[PDB]
Amino acid sequence: HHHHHLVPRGSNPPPPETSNPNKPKRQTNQLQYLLRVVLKTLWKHQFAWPFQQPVDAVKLNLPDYYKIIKTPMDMGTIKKRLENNYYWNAQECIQDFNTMFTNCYIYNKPGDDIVLMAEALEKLFLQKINELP
Numbered sequence: 001h002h003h004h005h006l007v008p009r010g011s012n013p014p015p016p017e018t019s020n021p022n023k024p025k026r027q028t029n030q031l032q033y034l035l036r037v038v039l040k041t042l043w044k045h046q047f048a049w050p051f052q053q054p055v056d057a058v059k060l061n062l063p064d065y066y067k068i069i070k071t072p073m074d075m076g077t078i079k080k081r082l083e084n085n086y087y088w089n090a091q092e093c094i095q096d097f098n099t100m101f102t103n104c105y106i107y108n109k110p111g112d113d114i115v116l117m118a119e120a121l122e123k124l125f126l127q128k129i130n131e132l133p
């Protein structure tokens, strides 16, 4: 038989939602600080770039990524969520940050460059989190 299964092809999943009209939302000073100070300083860092958008498993050649990571998260998604006032409190936003870092440590091993980048950002994240209102 001549069907060699060259199609159907692989793909990336739909990225996480940055809007939800029915979701409860607020603008708190902690959430404003998370956008104004915490997100924007992590975003400017030289190790930020791999975390600034959802993982493209096809482009980056990580076809096992969404087999292992079932709750993906990135700083681009958190930035859009903060800009759209998507969160109810700081805990929801901080949990997204925690998910992003945890995904990186689950998927990769100690010593990998991406983990060294994640640890540096987490170190810096936790310092900025200590100065929350």
Ligand SMILES: CCN1C(=O)c2cccc3c(NS(=O)(=O)c4ccc(F)cc4Cl)ccc1c23
Binding pocket: 050, 051, 055, 060, 062, 103, 104, 107, 108, 112, 113, 114, 117
């Ligand atoms: C945090 C998202 N992320 C990963 O977990 C991950 C593992 C392996 C490669 C890449 C990746 N590919 S990449 O841009 O070529 C890259 C970035 C930093 C690095 F140290 C190594 C690679 Cl291969 C982008 C985003 C992620 C990964």
